[PDB]
Amino acid sequence: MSGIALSRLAQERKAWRKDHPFGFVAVPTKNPDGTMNLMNWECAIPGKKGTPWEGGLFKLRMLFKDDYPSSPPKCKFEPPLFHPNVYPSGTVCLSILEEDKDWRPAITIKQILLGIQELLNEPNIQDPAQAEAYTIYCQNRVEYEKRVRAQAKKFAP
Amino acid sequence: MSGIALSRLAQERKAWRKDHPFGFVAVPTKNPDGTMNLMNWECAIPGKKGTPWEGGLFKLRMLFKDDYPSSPPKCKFEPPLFHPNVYPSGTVCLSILEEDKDWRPAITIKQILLGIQELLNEPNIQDPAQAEAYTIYCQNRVEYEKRVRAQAKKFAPS
Amino acid sequence: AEPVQEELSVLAAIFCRPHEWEVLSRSETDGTVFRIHTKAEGFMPLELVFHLPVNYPSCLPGISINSEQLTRAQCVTVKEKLLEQAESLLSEPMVHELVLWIQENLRHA
């Protein structure tokens, strides 16, 4: 069942290179032998501007199962981020990234990355994944945005 | 916006959706905005069978303070019920629903609803919350259960 | 060239057979020659040998079809026509597209 997947990831790639949103990165990693790993991607998401996430470029890895595209990718921030919906392991907690929920095989890698970027400044109250970020986000948002700006500055080239 | 509260409540929600007792309902209410209010829940408890309280589905609202889960939730029957341990406002008088008593932060919404359901056919003599229901329950239980069955039939769903 | 070598890598990945894919030759001049067998038929078995000169994809690739479950007379039609949307997908890595274009297709429909 890897054929439909490797092909699909391959439809994702050239469409991405031909046209993709500005400041976004999505690149399949490369094997030591000299082949291409389509099941594993190194991606980057830019912070929206007018926000505390601004000037920031935040790196995440995308992993695809063999039954892709009927299963969603596993999206993990490396390094892990300070966000209410991001686990200490860097895993992203999103509704469209889980199969029994709002995942569709029609969902593009672009749509995923955009949804996560949207999630950056719009945390979901119903998906606590990180204790510190969630609690501070609710309690004192000024201080929360303080942390976000420091983190954004840390990942600005 | 209480972080500790909303976090715990969101996991209570997902745990309830994954597994919960049959005939029980626990759904967060909807805000005027159209968002989800985790601090306010609309719940329903079915009567256990082997008892006078059945065929009845009794609706109760669960309300959480900002210091939840350090305080127990306030469980209030709407509409108010005829029970020795239920206040005229429909508030439930239970030991696990009291901070200075047997409330623990580890207690789940599921456990609470089950405990209240237990309280329905097993009133506590040491906790009078409604005077008439209590007195009738102690002295003339025949009329008490008559009223209970009439109420149970009255609150039977469609 | 970056687009080309990325295409080569992707093709080498898409196929994880045993005898799928091979690079027949590499050179600064004349470019790269490789072979793929991709399998297709269900009713009424393909070897495709692509040559990528150093001008591809701006230029046309050299192709060749062997498929002795099929006759040979078609291979001239099929090479002189896998050539078409090769001209449509011109200026960009087209190999993957052609490959998956023809297990859809045996000059069908």
Curated annotation (Swiss-Prot), chain A:
Expressed in heart, skeletal muscle, pancreas, kidney, liver, lung, placenta and brain. Also expressed in testis and thymus. The modification N-acetylserine is found at S2. Changing R61A: Slightly impairs binding to RANBP2. The modification Phosphoserine is found at S71. Keywords: Acetylation, ATP-binding, Cell cycle, Cell division, Chromosome partition, Cytoplasm, Host-virus interaction, Isopeptide bond, Mitosis, Nucleotide-binding, Nucleus, Phosphoprotein, Transferase, Ubl conjugation, Ubl conjugation pathway. The record marks I4, V25, L57 as: Interaction with RANBP2. There is a cross-link at K18 (Glycyl lysine isopeptide (Lys-Gly) (interchain with G-Cter in ubiquitin)). Phosphorylation at Ser-71 significantly enhances SUMOylation activity. GO terms for molecular function: ATP binding; enzyme binding; HLH domain binding; RING-like zinc finger domain binding; RNA binding; small protein activating enzyme binding; SUMO conjugating enzyme activity; SUMO transferase activity. PROSITE patterns: UBC_1, UBC_2. Changing K48A: Slightly impairs binding to RANBP2. There is a cross-link at K49 (Glycyl lysine isopeptide (Lys-Gly) (interchain with G-Cter in SUMO1)). SMART domains: UBCc. Coiled coil: none annotated. Changing V27A: Impairs binding to RANBP2. Accepts the ubiquitin-like proteins SUMO1, SUMO2, SUMO3, SUMO4 and SUMO1P1/SUMO5 from the UBLE1A-UBLE1B E1 complex and catalyzes their covalent attachment to other proteins with the help of an E3 ligase such as RANBP2, CBX4 and ZNF451. Can catalyze the formation of poly-SUMO chains. Necessary for sumoylation of FOXL2 and KAT5. Essential for nuclear architecture and chromosome segregation. Sumoylates p53/TP53 at 'Lys-386'. Mediates sumoylation of ERCC6 which is essential for its transcription-coupled nucleotide excision repair activity. This is SUMO-conjugating enzyme UBC9. It comes from Homo sapiens. The gene is UBE2I.
Curated annotation (Swiss-Prot), chain B:
The modification N-acetylserine is found at S2. Changing L57A: Impairs binding to RANBP2. Keywords: Acetylation, ATP-binding, Cell cycle, Cell division, Chromosome partition, Cytoplasm, Host-virus interaction, Isopeptide bond, Mitosis, Nucleotide-binding, Nucleus, Phosphoprotein, Transferase, Ubl conjugation, Ubl conjugation pathway. There is a cross-link at K18, K48, K49, K101 (Glycyl lysine isopeptide (Lys-Gly) (interchain with G-Cter in SUMO2)). Pathway: Protein modification; protein sumoylation. It is an enzyme of class 2 (transferase). The modification Phosphoserine is found at S71. The record marks D100, K101 as: Substrate binding. GO terms for biological process: cell division; chromosome segregation; mitotic nuclear membrane reassembly; modulation of chemical synaptic transmission; negative regulation of DNA-templated transcription; negative regulation of transcription by RNA polymerase II; nuclear export; positive regulation of canonical NF-kappaB signal transduction. The modification N6-acetyllysine is found at K65. Changing R61A: Slightly impairs binding to RANBP2. Forms a complex with SENP6 and UBE2I in response to UV irradiation. Forms a tight complex with RANGAP1 and RANBP2. Identified in a complex with SUMO2 and UBE2I, where one ZNF451 interacts with one UBE2I and two SUMO2 chains, one bound to the UBE2I active site and the other to another region of the same UBE2I molecule. Interacts with SETX. Interacts with HIPK1 and HIPK2. Interacts with PPM1J. Interacts with RASD2. Interacts with TCF3. Interacts with NR2C1; the interaction promotes its sumoylation. Interacts with SIAH1. Interacts with PARP. (Microbial infection) Interacts with human herpesvirus 6 IE2. This is SUMO-conjugating enzyme UBC9. It comes from Homo sapiens (Human). The gene is UBE2I.
Curated annotation (Swiss-Prot), chain C:
It comes from Homo sapiens (Human). The chain holds residues 2 to 113 of 267 of the full protein. The RWD domain is required for the sumoylation enhancement activity. Residues 6-108 form the RWD domain. Residues 12-14, 95-97 are annotated as: Interaction with UBE2I/UBC9. Induction: Induced by hypoxia and heat shock. Isoform 1 and isoform 2 are expressed in glioma tumors (at protein level). Expressed in a wide number of tissues with highest expression in cerebellum, pituitary, heart, kidney, liver, stomach, pancreas, prostate and spleen. Low levels in thalamus, spinal cord, esophagus, thymus, lung and peripheral blood leukocytes. A higher level expression seen in pituitary tumors as compared to the pituitary gland. This is RWD domain-containing protein 3. It comes from the Eukaryota. Isoform 1 and isoform 2 interact with UBE2I/UBC9. Isoform 1 shows a greater interaction with NFKBIA and HIF1A as compared to isoform 2. Isoform 2 interacts with NCOA2 and NR3C1. Enhancer of SUMO conjugation. Via its interaction with UBE2I/UBC9, increases SUMO conjugation to proteins by promoting the binding of E1 and E2 enzymes, thioester linkage between SUMO and UBE2I/UBC9 and transfer of SUMO to specific target proteins which include HIF1A, PIAS, NFKBIA, NR3C1 and TOP1. Isoform 1 and isoform 2 positively regulate the NF-kappa-B signaling pathway by enhancing the sumoylation of NF-kappa-B inhibitor alpha (NFKBIA), promoting its stabilization which consequently leads to an increased inhibition of NF-kappa-B transcriptional activity. Disulfide bonds: none annotated. It is found in: Nucleus; Cytoplasm.
